[PDB]
């Protein structure tokens, strides 16, 4: 059993799913949760509620590893950003850096074709 | 597309004096020198069609000037094409 | 989906089929009563598959037809025509009309039974029929017409205007008949080699066969077979295609 | 001949040889009968993003009027000399002698 505290939190949100993972300052994963592992499937898997629940599951995993400090970064286009990070405010940490780190290309390679719908 | 000094050499050769520019002789000479120089460009830059559009304009402009001078005075025409070696 | 409407061409099709006893006849897709009746009439008894169980009830309860046919109610692509050929004493005459998404499957299932089928007689859309009979050097030619002409001799029977159909389509369509060869004029070591040779070739039909079949064989193999590798895939007869298939199979 | 700006940056841990670099390149300029109108250093200076995983690298400017040929020599000398981590050459309109804003801030 290991106790450390310096914490980086990554929110990886998409219109199918939201993964959340906690890492050390090194970026080394301490533990993680998703929505789909929270148990929701199809439509429920991508909901602000499922993203809160995923954050609660991570909050439990870090209670075992580290809880004093966190630096939270957010990625992917999906819903529930606010919902999952306010769920990190549950068992609240002292955090101040927020931006997205959503990948924007400087005119990178050809995206998929549009859906015929 | 030519240095002022190569232009000066050419106009001081083919021109009436330093006040002359654009006597037919001056024109066809500097135009010829440009055409000669650009052979080096296109010998590398084969695919430079947009540049060679200017070259085609220049060789046809040369032809038009020569033919005007030929009907205006055969002596000036023949000694000028002799000096430039034109109709090569 | 479609089924025919006008007695003139119904009568032309059922008469051109020449359906009589001394033939192991089976309908597929009996559809509207009007075109299944004359064939169930002329044959003293007839077998049929309908895919639909509701139409199979409509026709099996019809006293013209239920007493005069034996009737089956399933996807014909499940159906064991090789056993039905045994039960009918001689290889089958298989015939009719359908919604024809299933058409491409029908041909392969019929070809899975080239021994058990004596002949096939079916309506189809103009472009696919003209493809199916297409001569090697034409844009209408290609892989499915190659496999069809490999398995069988193929023969247009007659051609039908779109106003002839109950829901009339925009699209003219023809009945065609075909005959599994009594011995294959093109003997082949395997058909999967044909199928993959033809798909590779026709997946690349605009480039030279050196840049199609020569992606697998050498130019010296191709010219060794007597084939110019500078041809396009749509210059190539089924004869040299089965020669390639034999070459692939026997040199592997 | 063509006026140029030549502007380049050197590894912080090779910044001590920068005078030797100014010798090597200024000798190429005057050895081409070219002339110089600015030479400047802005010291070790911090980078907006990491260059070659480094920080704080040492910045240098020249204003010059040399014949084209030797610019390609010193340019390719930058790809030979790994102490130079980047360079930019600019075919500027004029010789310019007034100090860089990077100096004039002092």
């Amino acid at each position: 059993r290991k106790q450390v505290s310096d914490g980086v939190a990554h929110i990886h949100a998409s219109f199918n799913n939201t993964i959340v993972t906690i890492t050390d300052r090194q970026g080394n994963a301490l533990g993680w949760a998703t929505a789909g592992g929270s148990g929701f499937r199809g439509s429920r898997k991508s909901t602000p509620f499922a993203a809160q629940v995923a954050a609660e599951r991570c909050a439990d995993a870090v209670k075992e590893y580290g809880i004093k400090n966190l630096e939270v970064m957010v990625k992917g286009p999906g819903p529930g950003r606010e919902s999952t990070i306010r769920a990190l405010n549950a068992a609240g940490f002292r955090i101040t850096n927020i931006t997205d780190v959503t990948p924007i290309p400087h005119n990178g390679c050809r995206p998929p074709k549009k859906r015929r719908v | 597309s030519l240095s002022t000094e190569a232009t000066a050499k050419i106009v001081s050769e083919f021109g009436r004096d330093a006040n002359d520019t654009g006597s037919t002789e001056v024109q066809v000479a500097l135009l010829t020198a440009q055409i000669n120089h650009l052979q080096g460009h296109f010998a590398e830059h084969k695919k430079d069609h947009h540049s060679r559009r200017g070259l085609l304009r220049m060789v046809s402009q040369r032809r038009k000037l020569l033919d005007y001078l030929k009907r205006k005075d055969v002596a000036r025409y023949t000694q000028l094409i002799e000096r430039l070696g034109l109709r090569r | 989906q479609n089924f025919l409407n006008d007695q003139f061409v119904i009568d032309s099709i059922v008469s051109a089929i020449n359906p009589q006893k001394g033939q192991a006849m089976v309908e597929i897709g009996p559809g509207l009563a009007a075109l299944t009746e004359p064939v169930g009439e002329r044959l003293d008894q007839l077998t049929v598959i309908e895919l639909d169980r509701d139409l199979a009830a409509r026709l099996q309860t019809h006293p013209f037809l239920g007493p005069k046919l034996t009737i089956y109610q399933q996807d014909a692509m499940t159906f064991n025509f090789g056993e039905l050929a045994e039960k009918m004493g001689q290889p089958l005459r298989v015939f009719g009309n359908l919604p024809y998404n299933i058409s491409t499957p029908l041909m392969f299932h019929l070809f899975s039974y080239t021994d058990a089928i004596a002949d096939m007689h079916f309506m189809l859309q103009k472009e696919v029929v003209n493809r199916l009979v297409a001569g090697p050097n034409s844009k209408a030619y290609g892989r499915l017409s190659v496999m069809a002409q490999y398995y069988c001799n193929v023969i247009p029977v007659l051609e039908v205007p779109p106003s002839a159909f109950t829901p009339p389509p925009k699209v003219d369509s023809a009945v065609v008949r075909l005959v599994p060869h009594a011995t294959m004029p093109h003997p082949v070591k395997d058909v999967r080699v044909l199928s993959r040779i033809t798909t590779e070739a026709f997946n690349q039909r605009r480039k030279t066969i050196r840049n199609s079949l020569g992606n697998l064989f050498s130019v010296e193999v191709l010219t060794g077979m007597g084939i110019d590798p500078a041809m396009r895939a749509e210059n190539i007869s089924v004869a040299q295609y089965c020669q390639m298939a034999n070459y692939l199979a026997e040199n592997a | 001949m063509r006026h140029y700006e030549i502007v380049f940056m050197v590894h912080p841990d090779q910044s001590e040889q920068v005078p030797g670099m100014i010798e090597r390149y200024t000798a190429a300029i005057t050895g081409a009968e070219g002339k110089i109108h600015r030479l400047e250093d802005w010291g070790r200076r911090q980078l907006a993003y990491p260059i070659n995983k480094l920080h704080k690298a040492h910045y240098v400017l020249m204003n010059v009027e040399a014949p084209q040929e030797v610019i390609d020599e010193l340019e390719t000398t930058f790809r030979f000399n790994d102490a130079v981590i980047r360079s930019m050459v600019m075919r500027t309109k004029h010789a310019v002698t007034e100090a860089s804003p990077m100096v004039k801030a002092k």
């Binding site: 400087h106 | - | - | 907006a48 993003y49 990491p50 910045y59 930019m88 860089s100 804003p101």
Partner: protein, 65 residues
């Protein structure tokens, strides 16, 4: 407009990071000319300058780098 036109009339610029900072987002993107009030001539010069300044890590490309 005319005050922003004076900013163009006075100067054409590269290496003046202090003035370049007047025309960038904090995320490092170029400001559109209508928001700067400057005329398009100077917008082009500013864009060319910013691109050079990014090449030499004088300005970032993004917020992060």
């Amino acid at each position: 407009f005319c005050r922003f036109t004076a900013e163009g009339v006075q100067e054409i610029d590269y290496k003046d990071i202090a003035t370049l900072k007047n025309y960038i987002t904090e995320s490092g993107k170029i400001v559109p000319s209508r928001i700067t009030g400057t005329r398009a001539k100077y917008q082009r010069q500013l864009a060319r300058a910013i691109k050079r300044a990014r090449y030499l890590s004088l300005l970032p490309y993004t917020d992060r780098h």
